Structure 1
Amino acid sequence: GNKLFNIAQRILDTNSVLLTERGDHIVWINNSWKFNSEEPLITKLILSIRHQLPKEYSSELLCPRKRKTVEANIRDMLVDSVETDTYPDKLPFKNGVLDLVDGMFYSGDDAKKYTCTVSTGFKFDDTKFVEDSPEMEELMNIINDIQPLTDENKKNRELYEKTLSSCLCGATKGCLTFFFGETATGKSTTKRLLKSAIGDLFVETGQTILTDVLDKGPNPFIANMHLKRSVFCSELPDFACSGSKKIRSDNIKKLTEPCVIGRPCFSNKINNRNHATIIIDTNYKPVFDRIDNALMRRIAVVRFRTHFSQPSGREAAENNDAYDKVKLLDEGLDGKIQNNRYRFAFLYLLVKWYKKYHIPIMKLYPTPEEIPDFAFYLKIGTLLVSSSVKHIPLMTDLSKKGYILYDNVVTLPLTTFQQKISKYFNSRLFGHDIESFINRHKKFANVSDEYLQYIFIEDISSP
């Protein structure tokens, strides 16, 4: 009774077709979850799977009409929806899924349970995923050359390792990392090593996402980051000199939210998943058009201070302090990195670092103290407070310091505020910052007189 319905039931029992929330069907052919909007693969799956069925069921799948009927039955049978790429601690390869927490590699039906629709693009070989090897020693030597293990570099080394290891997690990250350092320091070598390690999950982008609008009209720059696990920004022009667009605070805020707004060309989908670890490479200090408290919590800085240079310019390179350690470059090193020589050794190192930081919740912590542009705004935030409970049993003593009373609200005249704030910062050095803060946070008692609703902590602490 209904051979075709029984065939559809068996194919559904094999769990090879799933219905997604967007209305598509994902099929498991050739050991990978595939889908297509313009050409479903359900009949391809039926023809391919005809070999696992009994004899009397296999000869009914050689007709396109019967395969169409089976596909209709399968479409009617699938009611509930599932979500794809819901495991943040799994790295999908071309022939399986690697577990970062456990270190065990799966293949075929074992990798089937993790609905991974993306992959690194290359196979995984266990014979090279080993600890003892000359490749491991060479990689360790290179890594120690780029980042020394001195006691003055411990925190920087830890942050570097954490940032590099977070590129394997398939979840939204809450920070952006700046790779601070001059040219010929090792940042490009790290970029090439990471690209060789993680294959197709790595993408590179210029200045478009930093200094330009994100949504606008069409934007392949923000639509090509869907399900990527790392984004590297390189060749960034100095924003200190006039003529270059500044870093947009709105862009930084949007590149951190779990939902990214943007659509590709000729696509009706506007929502894409953001899994990338954004790293910005710059040879100069970064400056932003706007600075506020929210933008301070989404920036981290990693500093590079060891360079490799030719013997001809060895003295000049040894003639400063930003190149804290001097070494000799290797001409064939670029070819070795390109030839995928250290790919699996770097994969092992990244997995080991991830395990070293595999605490139940993996998060990226901002480091705002390393940005010179944040120096003024960080210090003033520890000097002023907002409105609070009852200044009434201090207005006797707060009045003598220049604070006035207004409808039971303490304000401060601009002249008195300037006089009290000039004792902590140089007028010339922070003039623009002081002016911007004053004109941003000023309150108008009337059209002419103006006041500020801020109280210095030093006055508060002093009885």
Structure 2
Amino acid sequence: GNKLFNIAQRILDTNSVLLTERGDHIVWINNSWKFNSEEPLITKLILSIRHQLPKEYSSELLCPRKRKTVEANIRDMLVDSVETDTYPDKLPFKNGVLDLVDGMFYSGDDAKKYTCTVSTGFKFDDTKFVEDSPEMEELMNIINDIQPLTDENKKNRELYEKTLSSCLCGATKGCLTFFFGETATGKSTTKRLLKSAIGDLFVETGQTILTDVLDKGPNPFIANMHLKRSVFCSELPDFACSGSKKIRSDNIKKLTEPCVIGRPCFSNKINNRNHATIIIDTNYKPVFDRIDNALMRRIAVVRFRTHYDKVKLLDEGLDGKIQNNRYRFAFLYLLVKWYKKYHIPIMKLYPTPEEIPDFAFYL
């Protein structure tokens, strides 16, 4: 019959193209679920899949006008929508999906079933993702310098490990964390170390969300945290000078549900999935709007004392060989090992309310 219809049916049977709920058309080119609302990539996929089809159909998909017809046929068969990003224990890279419960690395069709849309940004190299390497020892030394393993730092170290390891699970987290410490302690160093490991699944959002009502008007700084594994907040100013806004109690309550409310500029989508791992980087002790029992269930603090309790020397190459992703996979191995150590059965982050003086007073 219609030769330009059996080709469309064959392309559809591989389940290479799907229809998401938000109306987009995610395709599968070069082991990645790419999508573009502006222009469609189905015509790229049609020419990419040319080799799988027999030679009789291969000579037909060269003319662009026939690929347009095949695309038109394909777009009239996607009736039912599917769901994306339903697997929490998976980390997607540009050339596969790292299974995180046992630390394998799948690719191709094996990575196709886990329908993940967002990606880390860069590629994964199995040769460098090893524990035996000088960069591993260097990074291990940096971590110990920033956070010592002394028994006076027992809980403060495992809590830090759990908080950092939680930045890989693709499920909603129900607690907040505070990186509190003096200037030049490792908070800013930890931020660049972490952002070099995960990549796109990391945004440095502004201070705004903690002291503003995220309902009226557009909030693109809210629409950015769509399926982002970790979000980082810095620049917490003094709460005594002019401009001393208060950390609104209800505001932190909204950034804990699986769905957050907010729309971008010139758009109508108001619901956003919340995979964030909100970390607030502060230098002074924060002052909240009002303290009730519903807050202390979602607060955690990780104290940083090393420059204090330790006077280590300031390195200069540290910031050099970080931004050019030297300790990229080395930090990934440590994070995977910590995730293996802490959350196999269920992912969960617990609050530490007996650590802020105001909460200690309330308790």
TM-score tier by shorter-chain length is over 0.9
- CA deviations over 1:188-233 (Å, ceiling 9, x no partner): 1111100111111111122111112213211111111111111111
Report if the CA contact (8 A) 2:185-2:306 is conserved. Answer: yes
CA contact (8 A) 1:20 1:82 kept: yes
Q: Does residue 318 of structure 2 align to residue 333 of structure 1?
A: yes
- In structure 2, C-alpha distance between the alignment counterparts of 1:105 and 1:258, rounded to whole Å: 28
CA distance in 2, matches of 1:38, 1:141: 47
CA shift at 1:46, angstroms?
A: 1.5
Checking the alignment, whether the CA contact within 8 Å between 1:7 and 1:57 is kept in structure 2 is yes
Deviations 1:53-72 (A, max 9, x none): 11222233234443333223
Per-residue deviation at 1:80? 2.5
Q: Give the whole-Å Cα distance in 1 for the aligned partners of 2:138 and 2:62.
A: 56
How far the C-alpha of 1:93 sits from its partner, in A, is: 0.9
Q: Which residue of 1 aligns with 2:250?
A: 250
Equivalent residues of 1:206, 1:236 under 8 A apart: no
1:262–1:272 Cα contact (<8 Å) kept:
yes
Does the alignment pair 1:280 with 2:265?
Answer: no
Cα shift at 1:110: 2.2
1:130–1:348: 8 Å Cα contact kept in structure 2? yes
Q: Secondary structure at the match of 2:225?
A: coil
CA distance in structure 2 between the aligned counterparts of 1:280 and 1:68, rounded to whole angstroms: 49
CA distances 1:308-351 after superposition (whole Å, capped 9, x unpaired): xxxxxxxxxxxxxxx02221111221112222111111000000
- Give, in angstroms, the shift of residue 38 of structure 1: 2.8
The Cα offsets for residues 375-412 of structure 1, whole Å up to 9 and x where unpaired, read as xxxxxxxxxxxxxxxxxxxxxxxxxxxxxxxxxxxxxx
Matching residue of 2:132: 132
Runs (5+) with no aligned partner, structure 2: 359-363
Give the drift of 1:186: 1.0
Asked which structure has the greater CA Rg, the reply is 1
1:89 is matched with 89
| Identity %, equivalent residues | 100
Deviation at 1:151, TM superposition (A): 1.1
* Separation (CA, whole Å) in 2 of partners of 1:47 and 1:103: 34
Describe the shift of the 1:70–1:339 C-alpha distance in structure 2 as closer, same or farther (beyond 3 A): closer
How far residue 51 of structure 1 moved from its aligned partner, in angstroms, is: 2.4
Deviation at 1:142, TM superposition (A): 1.1
Give, in angstroms, the shift of residue 297 of structure 1. Answer: 0.8
- For residue 30 of structure 1, report the CA deviation from its aligned partner: 2.8
Which 4+ runs in 1 deviate beyond 6 A?
none
Structure 1 contact 175–300 (Cα < 8 Å) conserved? yes
Give, in angstroms, the shift of residue 244 of structure 1: 1.3
Report the Cα distance in structure 1 between the residues aligned to 2:196 and 2:243, rounded to whole angstroms.
35
Per-residue deviation, 1:2: 2.0
Return the alpha-carbon distance in structure 2 between the equivalents of residues 95 and 108 of structure 1: 8
Cα deviation for residue 87 of structure 1 reads: 1.1
Q: Secondary structure at the match of 1:326?
A: coil
Which residue of the partner structure matches residue 123 of structure 2?
A: 123
Give the C-alpha shift of residue 240 in structure 1.
Answer: 4.2
Give the SS at the match of 1:298. coil
Distance 2:180 2:317 in 1: 25
Structure 1 position 11, deviation (Å) = 0.5
Kindly indicate whether the alpha-carbon contact (under 8 Å) linking 2:169 and 2:347 is maintained by their aligned counterparts in 1.
Answer: no
1:354-376 deviation per Cα after TM superposition (whole angstroms, max 9, x unaligned): 00012311101111111111xxx
Contact 2:254 2:260 in 1 (8 A): yes
Higher RCO (CA 8 Å, separation ≥ 6 residues)? 2
**Structure 1 residue 94 displacement after superposition:** 1.3
Match of 2:241, SS state, is coil
- 1:42-90 CA distance string (max 9 Å, x none): 2232222222211222233234443333223323332232111111111
Residue deviations 1:131-170, cap 9 Å, x none?
1111111111111111111111110101000000101111
For residues 264-320 of structure 1, what are the alpha-carbon distances to aligned partners after superposition, in whole Å with 9 as ceiling and x for unaligned? 22223222221111111111111111211111111111111122xxxxxxxxxxxxx
Between the aligned partners of 2:167 and 2:106, the Cα distance in structure 1 is 20
Q: Secondary structure of 1:179's partner?
A: strand
Structure with the bigger percentage of helix: 1
Asked whether the equivalents of residues 30 and 95 of structure 2 are also in contact (C-alpha less than 8 Å), the reply is no
**SS of 2:281's equivalent?**
strand
> Structure 1 residues 109 and 279 mapped into 2: Cα distance closer, same or farther (>3 Å)?
same
Secondary structure in structure 1 of the residue aligned to 2:18: strand
3-state SS of 1:92 partner: strand
Deviation at residue 5 of structure 1 after TM alignment? 2.1
- TM (norm. structure 1) is 0.75
**How far apart in 2 are the matches of 1:52 and 1:206?**
47
- Segments of structure 1 that go 5 or more residues without pairing to the other structure are 308-322, 374-463
Whether contact under 8 Å (2:101, 2:344) holds in the other structure is no
8 A contact 1:19–1:82 mirrored in 2: yes
RMSD: 1.5
Q: Residue by residue, what CA displacement relative to the aligned partner does 1:232-254 show, whole Å, maximum 9, x if unpaired?
A: 11121012445311111122111
The more displaced of 44-53 and 344-353 is: 44-53
In structure 2, relative to structure 1, the CA distance for the partners of 1:159 and 1:240 (3 Å cut) is farther
Number of aligned residues: 358
| Higher deviation after alignment, 175-184 or 70-79 | 70-79
The one-character-per-residue Cα deviations of 1:402-429 (angstroms, maximum 9, x if unpaired) are xxxxxxxxxxxxxxxxxxxxxxxxxxxx
Q: CA 1:176–1:240 in structure 2 vs 1: closer, same or farther (change >3 Å)? A: farther
Deviates more, 1:360-369 or 1:45-54: 45-54
Partner SS, residue 215 of structure 1? coil
1: CA distance between counterparts of 2:264 and 2:252?
A: 20
Shift of 1:12: 1.0
